Nucleic acid binder design. Sequence first.
DNA 1: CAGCCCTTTTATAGCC
DNA 2: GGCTATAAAAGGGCTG
Lengths: 204, 187
Amino acid sequence: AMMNAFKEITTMADRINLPRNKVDRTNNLFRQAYEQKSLKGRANDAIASACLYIACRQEGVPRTFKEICAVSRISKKEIGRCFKLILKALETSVDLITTGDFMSRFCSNLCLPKQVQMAATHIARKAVELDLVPGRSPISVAAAAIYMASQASAEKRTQKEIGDIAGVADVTIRQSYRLIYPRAPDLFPTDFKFDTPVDKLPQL
Amino acid sequence: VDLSKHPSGIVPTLQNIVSTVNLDCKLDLKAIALQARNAEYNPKRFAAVIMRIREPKTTALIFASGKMVCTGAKSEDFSKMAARKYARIVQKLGFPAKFKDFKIQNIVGSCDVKFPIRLEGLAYSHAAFSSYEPELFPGLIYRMKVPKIVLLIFVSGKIVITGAKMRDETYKAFENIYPVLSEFRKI
DNA sequence: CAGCCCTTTTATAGCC
DNA sequence: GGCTATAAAAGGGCTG
């Protein structure tokens, strides 16, 4: 139940490219959710997934729920559920997850340059600093900002391309994008380049 | 209002009361289905007749054991009232209806602080009591120490306070959390 | 074979 | 609309 569980954990880890750190910590979490358990009828590889979720985040490098699931089988639901159960059980919690948390990865899979990453990362922080996107999920804001940034450079990517990697839906990205667009000027880096200028950015 | 009891100056408006009552008589759902008409019985999904009545707009789940559950009422007394009307229906159908054991099980209520809230500051400050994952649900699920009621703070100021068996626990929760909400008001 | 799930209500709200 | 989330009862169902 435990050893074979770790058999799968490693498989999970590998598929999404996790190095020793979180991959080990997830076993340490999982071994505890057996001692200090109370995770009763929960899938052993659900307790696992959630662990390799609370792990990435405790390492300072989190991935979305959709990211873990796409290497799991146990629904986003269960990993969301056992995740909550696990934090309570073990009397531990995490750090919130922010705009500039997925910017590195999202941008790498999107194949954009350090230029675009940095600006998306500065836009998203000011979007929040300027409270332009009230109750939006940080993933959404980020995917939105990544669309402003990239669309204002050469290397552009579409909402279907960004949404696809960010794990969100064009509709949603459009929602935040359109919320921050009206402040586009105040959002970019300053020394930002511009294959296409703000007065030209898609209004959406 | 009553600043002695609701110092916040806001009184949570009750939104849904769930009560249970035991009719004593063993019911024939098969029967009850055929004539009730305001009912709805489907052995397929749920093993209980699901009957509803206009005024007070409630819904009842009736089992072949006498045990009924009333939900939807916007007030205990009303939950109680409707619960009687159900029994009197079952009664008027040919059953030994008895209003034994009636009890209020959960009071759901809502509220509006009238100001937006910096959830993250609250999720961070009341770590022990708060769960705020924008990824799983757009609300901050707070779990109050005493009373044992769950609130669900949002960014707009609308609150939702569940788990109460006594409307006053509901009040004790909000007044408890109000000065936390006020502290984390959005600048 | 303790443990969750189904079903019904209600406020609330972002994402699909 | 739907999903997700919270509490609560009822009795059967599916189960790790």
